[PDB]
Short mmCIF file of C-alpha atoms in Angstrom, two decimals:
data_model
loop_
_atom_site.label_atom_id
_atom_site.label_comp_id
_atom_site.label_asym_id
_atom_site.label_seq_id
_atom_site.Cartn_x
_atom_site.Cartn_y
_atom_site.Cartn_z
CA UNK A 35 62.45 101.97 97.44
CA UNK A 36 60.61 102.58 100.39
CA UNK A 37 59.27 106.91 101.33
CA UNK A 38 60.27 107.21 105.96
CA UNK A 39 59.57 110.73 106.09
CA UNK A 40 56.50 112.03 104.41
CA UNK A 41 54.23 114.69 103.93
CA UNK A 42 50.38 113.98 102.88
CA UNK A 43 48.46 115.30 101.28
CA UNK A 44 48.60 118.79 98.68
CA UNK A 45 45.39 120.29 97.32
CA UNK A 46 44.63 122.69 94.19
CA UNK A 47 42.01 124.83 92.55
CA UNK A 48 41.78 126.87 89.78
CA UNK A 49 39.95 129.97 89.87
CA UNK A 50 38.66 133.20 87.81
CA UNK A 51 41.80 134.71 87.76
CA UNK A 52 44.27 132.27 88.83
CA UNK A 53 45.19 129.30 90.70
CA UNK A 54 45.35 128.18 94.84
CA UNK A 55 47.38 125.55 96.46
CA UNK A 56 47.56 124.60 99.76
CA UNK A 57 49.53 121.76 101.63
CA UNK A 58 50.27 121.00 105.32
CA UNK A 59 53.63 121.33 107.22
CA UNK A 60 53.67 117.92 109.13
CA UNK A 61 56.32 115.55 108.07
CA UNK A 62 55.48 112.48 109.40
CA UNK A 63 57.83 109.17 110.26
CA UNK A 64 54.95 106.72 109.79
CA UNK A 65 52.80 107.21 112.85
CA UNK A 66 54.98 109.65 114.43
CA UNK A 67 54.28 113.31 113.72
CA UNK A 68 57.59 113.94 113.85
CA UNK A 69 58.51 117.28 112.03
CA UNK A 70 56.08 120.25 112.25
CA UNK A 71 57.54 122.77 110.30
CA UNK A 72 57.93 121.15 106.97
CA UNK A 73 57.52 123.81 104.30
CA UNK A 74 55.51 121.73 101.07
CA UNK A 75 54.79 124.38 99.01
CA UNK A 76 57.79 125.66 96.53
CA UNK A 77 58.03 129.09 95.18
CA UNK A 78 59.81 129.28 91.80
CA UNK A 79 59.82 132.68 91.01
CA UNK A 80 56.37 134.95 90.73
CA UNK A 81 54.54 133.09 88.73
CA UNK A 82 54.76 128.89 90.18
CA UNK A 83 54.55 127.24 92.80
CA UNK A 84 54.86 123.50 93.44
CA UNK A 85 53.13 121.83 95.97
CA UNK A 86 55.24 118.21 97.23
CA UNK A 87 53.89 115.30 99.17
CA UNK A 88 55.54 111.96 99.90
CA UNK A 89 58.67 111.47 100.92
CA UNK A 90 60.50 114.80 102.26
CA UNK A 91 64.09 114.07 101.47
CA UNK A 92 63.29 113.64 97.81
CA UNK A 93 61.50 116.66 98.31
CA UNK A 94 63.92 118.54 99.07
CA UNK A 95 66.07 117.54 96.23
CA UNK A 96 63.45 118.75 93.69
CA UNK A 97 63.67 122.06 95.23
CA UNK A 98 67.19 122.00 95.34
CA UNK A 99 66.49 121.21 91.28
CA UNK A 100 64.12 123.83 90.91
CA UNK A 101 67.12 126.55 92.53
CA UNK A 102 69.75 125.39 90.32
CA UNK A 103 67.12 126.07 86.89
CA UNK A 104 65.91 129.36 88.44
CA UNK A 105 70.18 130.09 88.65
CA UNK A 106 70.42 127.80 84.92
CA UNK A 107 68.15 129.67 83.20
CA UNK A 108 69.51 133.43 84.20
CA UNK A 109 72.82 132.53 82.92
CA UNK A 110 73.24 134.31 79.18
CA UNK A 111 69.69 135.30 79.44
CA UNK A 112 68.97 139.38 80.11
CA UNK A 113 65.27 138.56 79.76
CA UNK A 114 64.90 135.69 82.57
CA UNK A 115 63.17 138.28 84.32
CA UNK A 116 60.85 139.17 81.57
CA UNK A 117 59.39 137.31 78.25
CA UNK A 118 62.21 134.25 78.53
CA UNK A 119 61.34 133.49 82.88
CA UNK A 120 60.52 130.21 84.03
CA UNK A 121 56.61 129.27 83.19
CA UNK A 122 54.91 126.95 84.38
CA UNK A 123 54.86 124.56 82.10
CA UNK A 124 58.49 124.61 81.47
CA UNK A 125 58.88 123.66 85.20
CA UNK A 126 56.18 120.63 84.98
CA UNK A 127 57.69 119.13 81.83
CA UNK A 128 61.00 119.21 83.31
CA UNK A 129 59.80 117.30 86.87
CA UNK A 130 57.81 115.53 85.10
CA UNK A 131 61.25 114.11 82.71
CA UNK A 132 62.91 113.69 85.81
CA UNK A 133 60.30 112.09 87.69
CA UNK A 134 59.60 109.40 84.55
CA UNK A 135 63.12 109.53 83.97
CA UNK A 136 63.87 107.64 87.50
CA UNK A 137 60.62 105.64 87.36
CA UNK A 138 62.53 103.83 84.30
CA UNK A 139 65.35 103.54 86.23
CA UNK A 140 63.72 101.91 88.62
CA UNK A 141 64.82 104.34 91.59
CA UNK A 142 61.87 106.69 91.86
CA UNK A 143 61.49 109.79 93.64
CA UNK A 144 58.76 108.89 95.71
CA UNK A 145 56.63 112.16 95.32
CA UNK A 146 53.80 113.53 93.90
CA UNK A 147 53.31 116.78 92.75
CA UNK A 148 51.35 119.45 91.71
CA UNK A 149 52.64 122.56 89.75
CA UNK A 150 50.86 125.41 90.07
CA UNK A 151 50.95 128.75 88.31
CA UNK A 152 49.83 131.38 85.70
CA UNK A 153 51.16 131.30 82.23
CA UNK A 154 52.52 134.47 80.90
CA UNK A 155 49.59 134.83 78.32
CA UNK A 156 47.56 134.91 81.95
CA UNK A 157 46.36 131.31 81.53
CA UNK A 158 45.89 129.22 84.57
CA UNK A 159 48.78 126.25 84.52
CA UNK A 160 47.61 123.44 87.39
CA UNK A 161 49.15 119.99 86.41
CA UNK A 162 49.67 115.94 88.84
CA UNK A 163 52.80 114.47 88.19
CA UNK A 164 53.67 111.13 90.28
CA UNK A 165 56.45 108.59 90.74
CA UNK A 166 55.37 107.13 87.87
CA UNK A 167 55.49 109.62 85.36
CA UNK A 168 51.54 109.95 85.76
CA UNK A 169 50.31 113.70 84.52
CA UNK A 170 47.58 114.90 84.15
CA UNK A 171 45.40 118.38 84.42
CA UNK A 172 41.95 119.23 86.31
CA UNK A 173 40.34 122.07 87.33
CA UNK A 174 40.90 120.80 90.66
CA UNK A 175 43.96 118.51 91.80
CA UNK A 176 44.42 117.04 95.51
CA UNK A 177 47.07 114.26 95.96
CA UNK A 178 47.03 111.60 98.66
CA UNK A 179 44.08 111.39 101.09
CA UNK A 180 42.80 114.66 99.48
CA UNK A 181 42.39 113.10 96.28
CA UNK A 182 39.87 111.33 97.78
CA UNK A 183 37.90 113.73 100.18
CA UNK A 184 38.63 117.37 99.18
CA UNK A 185 38.38 116.89 95.68
CA UNK A 186 34.80 116.39 95.74
CA UNK A 187 34.37 119.07 97.55
CA UNK A 188 36.24 121.35 94.95
CA UNK A 189 34.03 119.83 92.21
CA UNK A 190 31.01 120.75 93.85
CA UNK A 191 32.70 124.47 93.43
CA UNK A 192 34.55 123.65 90.05
CA UNK A 193 32.84 120.65 88.24
CA UNK A 194 33.78 121.80 84.60
CA UNK A 195 36.18 124.37 83.19
CA UNK A 196 32.77 126.84 82.30
CA UNK A 197 33.21 126.89 86.20
CA UNK A 198 36.28 128.78 86.40
CA UNK A 199 35.58 131.91 85.83
CA UNK A 200 32.46 132.16 87.55
CA UNK A 201 34.44 131.04 90.71
CA UNK A 202 35.59 133.75 92.50
CA UNK A 203 39.35 133.62 94.55
CA UNK A 204 36.90 134.31 97.91
CA UNK A 205 34.79 131.06 97.22
CA UNK A 206 37.96 129.35 96.53
CA UNK A 207 40.00 130.03 98.89
CA UNK A 208 36.85 129.33 101.41
CA UNK A 209 36.62 126.39 99.60
CA UNK A 210 40.32 124.99 100.42
CA UNK A 211 40.60 125.64 103.86
CA UNK A 212 36.98 123.76 104.24
CA UNK A 213 38.58 120.82 102.83
CA UNK A 214 42.08 121.56 104.95
CA UNK A 215 39.57 121.27 107.57
CA UNK A 216 37.92 118.07 106.71
CA UNK A 217 41.79 116.42 106.39
CA UNK A 218 42.31 118.14 109.81
CA UNK A 219 39.14 115.85 110.93
CA UNK A 220 40.06 112.24 108.83
CA UNK A 221 43.69 111.89 107.86
CA UNK A 222 45.83 110.85 110.64
CA UNK A 223 48.75 111.70 109.02
CA UNK A 224 47.85 115.77 108.98
CA UNK A 225 48.10 119.16 110.62
CA UNK A 226 45.98 121.65 111.78
CA UNK A 227 48.89 124.08 110.61
CA UNK A 228 49.55 124.16 107.00
CA UNK A 229 50.46 127.02 104.39
CA UNK A 230 47.97 128.63 101.05
CA UNK A 231 49.44 129.91 98.30
CA UNK A 232 47.59 131.80 95.65
CA UNK A 233 49.02 132.63 92.04
CA UNK A 234 47.03 135.69 90.69
CA UNK A 235 47.60 136.82 86.96
CA UNK A 236 46.72 140.06 88.15
CA UNK A 237 48.04 140.80 91.99
CA UNK A 238 50.60 138.16 91.51
CA UNK A 239 51.82 135.39 93.81
CA UNK A 240 50.30 135.70 97.89
CA UNK A 241 52.39 132.87 99.68
CA UNK A 242 50.30 132.43 103.54
CA UNK A 243 52.41 130.58 106.00
CA UNK A 244 51.13 129.25 109.29
CA UNK A 245 47.72 129.11 108.71
CA UNK A 246 45.56 127.42 111.09
CA UNK A 247 42.51 124.84 110.56
CA UNK A 248 39.62 127.53 112.66
CA UNK A 249 36.29 126.61 113.57
CA UNK A 250 36.01 122.91 114.45
CA UNK A 251 32.50 121.10 115.83
CA UNK A 252 33.51 118.75 118.61
CA UNK A 253 30.64 119.61 121.10
CA UNK A 254 28.34 116.56 119.77
CA UNK A 255 31.53 114.55 120.81
CA UNK A 256 29.62 114.69 124.73
CA UNK A 257 26.61 112.80 123.24
CA UNK A 258 28.51 109.67 122.30
CA UNK A 259 28.08 107.29 125.19
CA UNK A 260 29.95 104.13 124.37
CA UNK A 261 29.59 101.92 121.07
CA UNK A 262 25.90 100.59 121.16
CA UNK A 263 24.25 99.63 124.57
CA UNK A 264 26.15 101.50 127.11
CA UNK A 265 23.65 104.53 128.12
CA UNK B 4 105.09 129.92 59.66
CA UNK B 5 105.93 127.26 61.83
CA UNK B 6 102.73 128.30 63.88
CA UNK B 7 100.41 127.25 61.59
CA UNK B 8 100.16 123.27 61.94
CA UNK B 9 97.79 122.84 64.61
CA UNK B 10 95.26 124.62 66.31
CA UNK B 11 96.99 124.54 69.93
CA UNK B 12 99.85 126.76 68.74
CA UNK B 13 100.03 130.16 69.43
CA UNK B 14 102.01 132.62 67.11
CA UNK B 15 104.13 135.21 68.56
CA UNK B 16 101.35 137.66 68.46
CA UNK B 17 98.93 135.12 69.56
CA UNK B 18 97.46 134.58 66.08
CA UNK B 19 95.57 131.42 65.86
CA UNK B 20 96.28 130.57 61.94
CA UNK B 21 94.61 127.00 61.55
CA UNK B 22 91.16 129.26 62.60
CA UNK B 23 92.08 132.58 60.52
CA UNK B 24 92.59 129.70 57.10
CA UNK B 25 89.31 128.38 58.18
CA UNK B 26 87.58 131.54 58.26
CA UNK B 27 89.44 132.09 54.70
CA UNK B 28 87.12 128.81 53.51
CA UNK B 29 84.07 131.52 54.37
CA UNK B 30 85.60 133.82 52.51
CA UNK B 31 85.58 131.43 49.19
CA UNK B 32 81.95 130.37 50.10
CA UNK B 33 79.65 132.31 48.11
CA UNK B 34 77.62 135.15 49.56
CA UNK B 35 74.91 134.39 51.63
CA UNK B 36 72.81 137.67 53.25
CA UNK B 37 71.21 137.54 56.39
CA UNK B 38 68.42 141.03 57.36
CA UNK B 39 66.14 141.34 60.04
CA UNK B 40 62.85 143.64 60.37
CA UNK B 41 61.16 143.46 64.22
CA UNK B 42 58.83 140.70 62.76
CA UNK B 43 60.54 138.55 60.06
CA UNK B 44 64.19 137.69 59.91
CA UNK B 45 65.02 136.53 56.10
CA UNK B 46 68.00 134.84 54.42
CA UNK B 47 69.05 135.07 50.61
CA UNK B 48 71.58 132.81 49.34
CA UNK B 49 72.97 132.82 46.36
CA UNK B 50 73.68 128.88 44.84
CA UNK B 51 76.87 127.94 42.82
CA UNK B 52 76.38 125.13 40.77
CA UNK B 53 79.76 123.12 39.86
CA UNK B 54 79.19 123.45 35.90
CA UNK B 55 76.28 123.78 33.42
CA UNK B 56 75.22 119.90 34.29
CA UNK B 57 75.04 120.20 37.59
CA UNK B 58 72.05 121.35 40.35
CA UNK B 59 72.87 124.40 42.19
CA UNK B 60 74.45 123.79 46.41
CA UNK B 61 72.09 123.99 49.07
CA UNK B 62 72.56 127.09 51.01
CA UNK B 63 69.82 126.98 53.44
CA UNK B 64 68.49 124.71 56.14
CA UNK B 65 65.58 124.47 58.40
CA UNK B 66 65.99 123.65 62.11
CA UNK B 67 62.56 124.23 63.27
CA UNK B 68 59.55 125.91 61.89
CA UNK B 69 60.57 129.24 64.33
CA UNK B 70 64.60 128.89 62.80
CA UNK B 71 66.71 128.05 60.23
CA UNK B 72 70.34 128.60 58.88
CA UNK B 73 72.59 129.16 56.23
CA UNK B 74 75.73 128.54 55.49
CA UNK B 75 79.05 129.84 53.09
CA UNK B 76 81.85 127.06 53.26
CA UNK B 77 82.57 123.61 54.00
CA UNK B 78 78.78 122.79 54.09
CA UNK B 79 79.63 119.08 55.82
CA UNK B 80 80.78 121.42 59.00
CA UNK B 81 77.32 122.93 58.34
CA UNK B 82 75.05 119.62 58.08
CA UNK B 83 76.92 118.15 61.47
CA UNK B 84 76.03 122.24 63.72
CA UNK B 85 73.20 121.75 61.46
CA UNK B 86 72.28 118.78 63.57
CA UNK B 87 73.32 119.77 66.38
CA UNK B 88 71.38 122.95 66.29
CA UNK B 89 68.10 120.58 65.94
CA UNK B 90 68.94 118.67 68.46
CA UNK B 91 69.32 121.58 70.67
CA UNK B 92 66.19 122.83 69.86
CA UNK B 93 64.43 118.99 70.36
CA UNK B 94 65.99 118.80 73.75
CA UNK B 95 64.58 122.32 74.44
CA UNK B 96 61.10 121.56 73.09
CA UNK B 97 61.02 117.94 75.31
CA UNK B 98 63.08 118.51 78.20
CA UNK B 99 60.83 121.85 79.24
CA UNK B 100 58.57 122.66 75.76
CA UNK B 101 60.09 125.39 75.50
CA UNK B 102 61.37 126.56 72.10
CA UNK B 103 64.95 127.43 72.26
CA UNK B 104 65.68 131.07 72.36
CA UNK B 105 68.52 132.49 69.41
CA UNK B 106 70.36 133.36 71.33
CA UNK B 107 70.98 130.46 73.08
CA UNK B 108 71.49 128.53 70.65
CA UNK B 109 74.13 130.66 68.73
CA UNK B 110 75.76 130.17 72.44
CA UNK B 111 75.74 126.14 72.28
CA UNK B 112 77.37 126.51 68.44
CA UNK B 113 80.10 128.64 70.11
CA UNK B 114 80.65 126.33 72.76
CA UNK B 115 80.71 123.59 70.35
CA UNK B 116 82.76 125.58 68.12
CA UNK B 117 85.24 126.48 70.29
CA UNK B 118 86.72 122.89 72.12
CA UNK B 119 88.40 122.46 68.20
CA UNK B 120 90.21 125.24 68.72
CA UNK B 121 91.46 125.02 72.16
CA UNK B 122 92.43 121.10 71.73
CA UNK B 123 94.50 118.86 69.79
CA UNK B 124 93.24 116.60 66.88
CA UNK B 125 90.16 118.43 65.89
CA UNK B 126 89.94 120.65 63.02
CA UNK B 127 87.99 124.53 63.22
CA UNK B 128 84.66 124.11 61.69
CA UNK B 129 85.21 125.61 57.70
CA UNK B 130 81.97 127.15 57.79
CA UNK B 131 80.46 130.40 58.43
CA UNK B 132 76.48 130.47 59.48
CA UNK B 133 73.65 132.53 59.71
CA UNK B 134 70.54 132.26 61.53
CA UNK B 135 67.32 133.54 61.43
CA UNK B 136 64.55 132.85 64.08
CA UNK B 137 61.70 134.05 65.98
CA UNK B 138 61.21 133.48 69.99
CA UNK B 139 59.55 135.09 72.68
CA UNK B 140 61.76 138.22 72.29
CA UNK B 141 61.30 138.63 68.16
CA UNK B 142 62.81 138.44 65.10
CA UNK B 143 66.64 137.45 65.33
CA UNK B 144 69.96 137.08 63.52
CA UNK B 145 72.95 135.18 64.13
CA UNK B 146 76.42 135.37 62.39
CA UNK B 147 78.40 132.79 63.59
CA UNK B 148 82.28 132.09 62.56
CA UNK B 149 83.88 128.89 63.41
CA UNK B 150 86.37 130.86 65.72
CA UNK B 151 83.31 130.44 67.89
CA UNK B 152 82.94 134.10 67.85
CA UNK B 153 78.58 134.62 67.90
CA UNK B 154 76.89 138.11 66.95
CA UNK B 155 73.42 139.24 67.66
CA UNK B 156 73.20 141.72 64.40
CA UNK B 157 70.01 143.43 62.49
CA UNK B 158 72.18 142.75 59.02
CA UNK B 159 75.09 140.87 57.92
CA UNK B 160 76.93 139.12 54.51
CA UNK B 161 79.28 136.60 54.75
CA UNK B 162 80.86 135.10 52.21
CA UNK B 163 82.72 136.76 48.52
CA UNK B 164 82.12 140.13 48.10
CA UNK B 165 79.58 140.36 50.84
CA UNK B 166 81.57 143.79 52.29
CA UNK B 167 79.23 145.31 49.10
CA UNK B 168 75.93 143.72 50.51
CA UNK B 169 77.35 144.32 53.95
CA UNK B 170 77.45 148.27 53.01
CA UNK B 171 74.27 148.67 51.42
CA UNK B 172 72.75 146.84 54.37
CA UNK B 173 74.66 149.50 56.72
CA UNK B 174 73.64 152.72 54.14
CA UNK B 175 69.68 151.28 54.59
CA UNK B 176 69.29 149.90 58.41
CA UNK B 177 67.20 152.71 59.26
CA UNK B 178 64.74 151.22 56.05
CA UNK B 179 64.49 147.86 56.00
CA UNK B 180 64.36 147.81 60.44
CA UNK B 181 60.76 149.58 60.33
CA UNK B 182 59.46 146.34 57.88
CA UNK B 183 57.41 144.84 59.86
CA UNK B 184 54.00 144.45 57.92
CA UNK B 185 55.59 143.20 54.32
CA UNK B 186 57.83 140.27 54.72
CA UNK B 187 58.09 140.61 50.92
CA UNK B 188 59.51 144.26 50.71
CA UNK B 189 62.36 142.78 53.37
CA UNK B 190 62.60 139.63 51.16
CA UNK B 191 63.14 142.76 48.63
CA UNK B 192 65.82 144.45 50.37
CA UNK B 193 67.56 141.31 51.00
CA UNK B 194 68.10 140.64 47.30
CA UNK B 195 69.22 144.07 46.33
CA UNK B 196 71.02 144.01 49.33
CA UNK B 197 72.91 140.32 47.82
CA UNK B 198 72.83 142.53 44.30
CA UNK B 199 75.92 144.50 45.42
CA UNK B 200 78.17 141.43 45.61
CA UNK B 201 77.28 139.69 42.52
CA UNK B 202 79.97 139.81 40.14
CA UNK B 203 79.34 139.33 36.50
CA UNK B 204 76.63 137.27 38.03
CA UNK B 205 72.90 137.23 37.49
CA UNK B 206 70.26 135.97 40.21
CA UNK B 207 68.11 133.26 38.75
CA UNK B 208 65.12 130.97 39.55
CA UNK B 209 67.82 128.55 40.10
CA UNK B 210 70.65 130.20 41.90
CA UNK B 211 68.54 132.58 44.15
CA UNK B 212 67.01 130.98 47.27
CA UNK B 213 64.90 132.65 50.23
CA UNK B 214 64.34 131.76 53.29
CA UNK B 215 61.77 133.82 55.97
CA UNK B 216 60.45 133.18 59.48
CA UNK B 217 58.68 135.45 61.64
CA UNK B 218 55.44 136.27 63.69
CA UNK B 219 53.38 134.00 62.00
CA UNK B 220 55.13 133.12 59.84
CA UNK B 221 57.04 129.59 60.00
CA UNK B 222 60.63 129.34 58.92
CA UNK B 223 60.30 128.52 54.75
CA UNK B 224 62.74 128.11 52.02
CA UNK B 225 61.39 129.77 48.26
CA UNK B 226 63.13 128.17 45.78
CA UNK B 227 62.96 128.09 41.99
CA UNK B 228 59.68 129.84 40.61
CA UNK B 229 58.99 130.59 44.52
CA UNK B 230 61.56 133.20 44.31
CA UNK B 231 60.98 134.95 40.42
CA UNK B 232 58.34 137.29 41.64
CA UNK B 233 61.70 139.28 43.98
CA UNK B 234 64.17 138.35 40.96
#
């Protein structure tokens, strides 16, 4: 009914061979920056990462549901490591079902979720669902405050699906890291510490923890004096 | 025999006579053959009419374009189990956007059937099923028995005189399993198998029905003049 501890933006991007998703490590408690080691990117197998924003208690509930789903999928399934592994699309559809059912019981999971992955055919998967069950896909996805600031920057790289094959992992990762820096400049509930995950159809999941926003520019602040007339 | 009055009674040798009698229902049913290659799975069913004025009863039921079954024995139980299997496939599609594996469908039927063997007041199903499907692991054929036993096979037959067809399939396994390019030759192998179970009867466009499923071959039932090619 009301979110208490909250994560903030998850941002993500397709690139030629995969998907990148990043989220910062902060649990805020209103304006109090209370918890600073909250991982909000949940890998599911080697082919999927779930990025969660919003209520951290509901996030922990979803993470439990995802671990249970992997366990259940392994039951009586000798190919659970192979052609009957969970796909990103299965995980997304399950989460979207849960979210919409919870909404329809007036008891929402107060989250926005991005499922990033690579399908077994090598297709990039990147889809959003929120607490309403509203779903959409785009070459770039961002939740929360990142929807307003990160998406413009990432779309300057990937404006349409025909930009995806032109976009390397280096360019996409640089764009994601710069967008995280911009969020640290401009989101009062952000952290300079973030996690980033790369899901490549060739090189698999690479999950980078304890990244820090670097190369911030602040020295121009020395010149700012008063609010108008103070010399 | 004091022990055959209900499913909840073991005999002194550990038999469940009501289950055995429900298997006798299957043994009285008309023959169905199943067989598969790697790319295709085929059902062949001899239908029986009540008399020269009656229609021939349906032996084959589509579940999905990826799955269907053939029945021997008590057809209303096959309707119940087919509706249940349809519901399970539907649920998998709706919740996970994934095609239900044939093996998991078989285990779901096993579990549904077992309850009727374990508790008072119900009864075992009186019907044997051959389930064919194509999934991410290729072609599959299952035999369901209402003891709840489900077995994955390259070929089998159920119903009256079915041991003749089963013997022929055992004899020709190493040929028909290789028939991957040519669904019509797998169908002809199945029709030659079922011929070994015929007594004082011939295949006709009236009494023969066929189904096939496979790689790019949605589950389709051939009956009437559509089977005249294979007679």
